[PDB]
């Protein structure tokens, strides 16, 4: 079906800035496009309907323009409540698609993550499972990539990660990634590595340990 691509997917800014988010459709949607702002924990809120009409009760710093395949939302003077995720929605064709969203967060200086790797506890091992956790602490911007390697084999499909919300004092994020293996598989290898790529790191940093080394 019809594709709606938002740009940028993520954007950093400060109070008082002017930002503009754009949304492009794969086929023309005339003026049937709406913009929403969604704050964490709340439902999306309508800002602009029919590509450019200002929704009632919505502050005038919000503006929408465009028609056909290209639309833009601009917030002229960013206020603290605007740090949020914005979505565009097309209503010309069924299904009524939403774009991927664009996250707007507090800009701060680039900060590389402090990385730490934790081996599984002997207590967990006795239960038969092995969790290897990697921590990326206080970094910025939000995008980071974690790659698990076991005896140099690239791992896939056996890890999960979660990211904290932007810190209200730091403006940094932290990320936890868990590699999970059976105790048996765990025992069949030695070098457990967490490889981290991030804008603040000149090149990828790797933190690792050799299993059973004492």
């Amino acid at each position: 079906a019809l594709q709606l691509t938002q740009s940028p997917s993520s954007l950093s800014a400060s109070v008082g800035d002017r930002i503009t988010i754009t949304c492009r459709a794969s086929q023309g949607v005339t003026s049937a496009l709406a913009w929403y702002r969604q704050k964490p924990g709340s439902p999306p809120q309508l800002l602009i309907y029919d590509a450019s009409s200002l929704e009632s009760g919505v502050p005038s710093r919000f503006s929408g323009s465009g028609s056909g395949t290209e639309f833009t939302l601009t917030i002229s003077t960013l206020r603290p409540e605007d740090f949020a995720t914005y979505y565009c929605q097309q209503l010309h064709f069924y299904p009524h698609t939403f774009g991927g969203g664009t996250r707007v967060d507090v800009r701060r200086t680039v900060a590389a993550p402090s990385v730490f790797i934790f081996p599984p506890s002997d207590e967990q091992l006795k239960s038969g499972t092995a969790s290897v956790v990697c921590l990326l602490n206080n970094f910025y911007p939000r995008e980071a990539k974690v790659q698990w390697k076991v005896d140099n084999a690239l791992q896939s499909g056996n890890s999960q990660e979660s990211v904290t919300e932007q810190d209200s004092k730091d403006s940094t994020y932290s990320l936890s990634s868990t590699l999970t293996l059976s105790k048996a598989d765990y025992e069949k290898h030695k070098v457990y590595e967490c490889e981290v790529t991030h804008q603040g790191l000149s090149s990828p940093v790797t933190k690792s340990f050799n299993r059973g080394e004492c």
Partner: peptide, 11 residues
Amino acid sequence: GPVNAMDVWGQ
């Protein structure tokens, strides 16, 4: 033009 949006949402 007013039909082009979902204007009120539930929590």
